[PDB]
Amino acid sequence: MQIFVKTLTGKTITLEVEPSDTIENVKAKIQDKEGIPPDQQRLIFAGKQLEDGRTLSDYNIQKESTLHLVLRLRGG
């Protein structure tokens, strides 16, 4: 199924995924397309940050759902 990801520039890219894909798999596909290492990615969907080890179906993500890609501004 094709989902959308809003990238760091605010542009929409498409991603071909399956409901059983883990969040790690999705971050690997984003790396493929956008070049961002998975360990730097955070995905926001419906107010949740998606957790490694869960699947897309765990969040009821479906065709044409939009995930929001963000980085980190770490501070102490």
Binding site: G35, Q49, R74, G75, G76
Partner: protein, 343 residues
């Protein structure tokens, strides 16, 4: 002091957490709901709700800076974890999700979406075939593009601007296969408490570098968003009042967080910098946090998250909270903990 509010103690690198906690504490309607959570059966140091109840209680009653070691204990953290620098919006998303889940099946179930959740609609129109589609989704904050934008308004304009889906991003139009298409977003509802994440970062694939964006970017004390709705309410305009400015200094990999708030929504501002709370001016909270160039004498200090409150909701969200709002079972458990600690 002359401020009337207390700070939070830093554990080592917990400024991001302190900045968030003040932000949530002065979301009074949320604070009162946290006070009502049925924590009586919870373990003192395992319960995130009980720890939040405790932090909030002491922020509301103490006269010295308040500690957070029981909250971080309830997160499962140990000493090392309190030295890791973190992103405040990451903590916001994780913490609120956790508290929302813990409120399910309780008398305050749904408080967090009531305060923070809006809905947007994404529509797609194919260009070469007659095929269109839309999708409506919830959000609890909004990611706003900064790079090349002067102000919040231009960011929202860009957010709702129509976008082309072509090339390696053609739209999957079902029986028509991949199709060139246009995509746009509009807001259906905006929530009483609006959290905005400024996208102050970029990634350079040529050097594997995370880079912070410190460009100037202006945000207003008052924010009208009606024009970004699918349909407006004449009895309830989407006019928003600036409540908090969560400020990051440094770069992607480290730095420091503070929060500026006018807790009452009345334009009287304070800076909350871990244990130091100090009066400040509007311009110190706002225009001074636009970013831009530094001087040669710290650096790269600017707004990262903004909190606005819908004008029509301001008196319900910032409703006063008294000791009549705190169950006496809760205050008793907190005294008990204090007395067992001093042992």
């Amino acid at each position: 002091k002359h401020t009337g509010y207390v700070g939070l103690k830093n554990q080592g690198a917990t400024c991001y957490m302190n900045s968030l906690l003040q932000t949530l504490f002065f979301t009074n309607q949320l604070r009162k709901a946290v006070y009502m959570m049925p924590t009586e059966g919870d373990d003192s140091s395992k319960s995130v709700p009980l720890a939040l109840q405790r932090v909030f209680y002491e922020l509301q009653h103490s006269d010295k800076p308040v500690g957070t070691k029981k909250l971080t204990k309830s997160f499962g953290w140990e000493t090392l974890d309190s030295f890791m620098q973190e992103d405040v919006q990451e903590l916001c998303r994780v913490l609120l999700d956790n508290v929302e889940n813990k409120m399910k099946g309780t008398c305050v179930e749904g408080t967090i979406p009531k305060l923070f959740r809006g809905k947007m609609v994404s529509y797609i129109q194919c260009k070469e075939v007659d095929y269109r589609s839309d999708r409506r989704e919830d959000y609890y904050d909004i990611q706003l593009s900064i790079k090349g934008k002067k102000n919040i308004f231009e960011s929202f304009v860009d957010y709702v601007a129509v976008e082309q889906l072509d090339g390696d991003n053609k739209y999957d139009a079902g029986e028509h296969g991949l199709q060139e298409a246009e995509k746009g977003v509009k807001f259906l509802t905006l929530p009483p408490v609006l959290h905005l994440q400024l996208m102050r970062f970029m990634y350079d694939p040529q050097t594997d570098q995370n880079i912070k964006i410190n460009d100037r970017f202006e945000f207003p004390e008052q924010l009208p968003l009606d024009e970004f709705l699918q349909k407006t309410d004449p009895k309830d305009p989407a006019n928003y009042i600036l409540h908090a400015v969560l400020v990051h200094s440094g770069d992607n990999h480290g730095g420091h967080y503070v929060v500026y708030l006018n807790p009452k929504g009345d334009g009287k501002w304070c800076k909350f910098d871990d244990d130091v709370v100090s009066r400040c001016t509007k311009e110190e909270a706002i225009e001074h946090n636009y970013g831009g160039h530094d001087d040669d004498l710290r650096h790269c200090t600017n707004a990262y998250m903004l909190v606005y409150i819908r004008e029509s909701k301001l008196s319900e969200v910032l409703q006063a909270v008294t000791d009549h709002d705190i169950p006496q079972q809760l205050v008793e458990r907190l005294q008990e903990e204090k007395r067992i600690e001093a042992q």
